[PDB]
Design a protein around this ligand. Structure first.
Ligand code: NI
Ligand code: NI
Lengths: 168, 175
């Protein structure tokens, strides 16, 4: 296959046994205002607030977001946090206190203009027509990419659209 | 709880029906050199190569990587791509042809120096101290000391990758 080590210099297979059980747990973005951020990730994207971790000594709050049923999460706060950090595919949205009130705060950089680096996260939806119609109805900002309230890029795709691209 | 909508202005919960089954599928980084990036994510982190997509009209290759048994994936290349895009928690590592040789390539920006923005990805390991001894053995660069229950290592482009175990998290939270 085109994914084989012979076709991909540097690819190491099989994974070392010491790594088995590692999970890709989070992607962290710095965010200006938790009110706008919470509304975007929870209302527009459908994620749940898995955990809010205030870190007073660092003047910051971590909002852990993801696609989970929090009605069945552990009720004990410590065990709910441990549960959160066992879940793959979360967002860590970091609010440094005061950015939302500082008239000199210049904004966070999204990686897609110089200096370039970070690209985007991407969400698999059921149907790109339905998803985009609904985003328009909610007043979402479009760059297929939408933008969160700090300007980070969020790619949207469905499996039928992927199949059509791969087939050309 | 401290995650309640009453305690968190802007929180819209539970999710809208239309978002049923949405998944957080990928985190995309631009990478200078696919051989270095494949070795880091596959050897150091233990990710697999789920899919390689050459896009010749954009002079780029997409390397999709994550924690999966790729021996379980479809053999049909089209179906294997579709399988990839139904897996949560992947990396999309984007190689623009020529950055690996260009003598004036300035590097990719990791978000943690001005102008700041993007932070990191993070990996839950079995045992931070065990993981870090092994990272050391593989010549991995560290951003901070393994202490206070977390560290960051750097990928070949300089992106930060947090490392923690659940005992580390529990210790942090209990303070
Ligand atoms: Ni993408
Ligand atoms: Ni983190």
């Amino acid at each position: 296959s085109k994914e084989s080590p012979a076709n991909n210099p540097g690819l190491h297979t099989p994974p070392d046994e010491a790594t088995k059980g590692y999970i890709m747990q989070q992607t962290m973005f710095r965010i200006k205002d938790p009110k706008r951020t919470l509304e975007f990730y929870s209302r527009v994207l459908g994620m749940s607030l898995l955990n809010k971790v205030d870190v007073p000594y660092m003047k910051m709050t971590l909002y852990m977001m993801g696609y989970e049923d929090v009605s069945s999460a552990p009720s004990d706060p410590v065990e709910k946090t441990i549960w959160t950090f066992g879940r793959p595919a979360t967002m860590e949205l970091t609010h440094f206190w005061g950015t939302e009130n500082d008239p000199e705060f210049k904004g966070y950089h999204n990686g897609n203009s110089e200096p370039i680096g970070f690209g985007h996260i991407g969400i698999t939806v059921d149907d790109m027509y339905k998803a985009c119609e609904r985003f328009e109805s909610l007043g979402v900002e479009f760059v297929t990419f939408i933008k969160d309230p700090d300007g980070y890029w969020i790619e949207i795709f469905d499996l039928n659209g992927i199949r059509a691209i791969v087939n050309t």
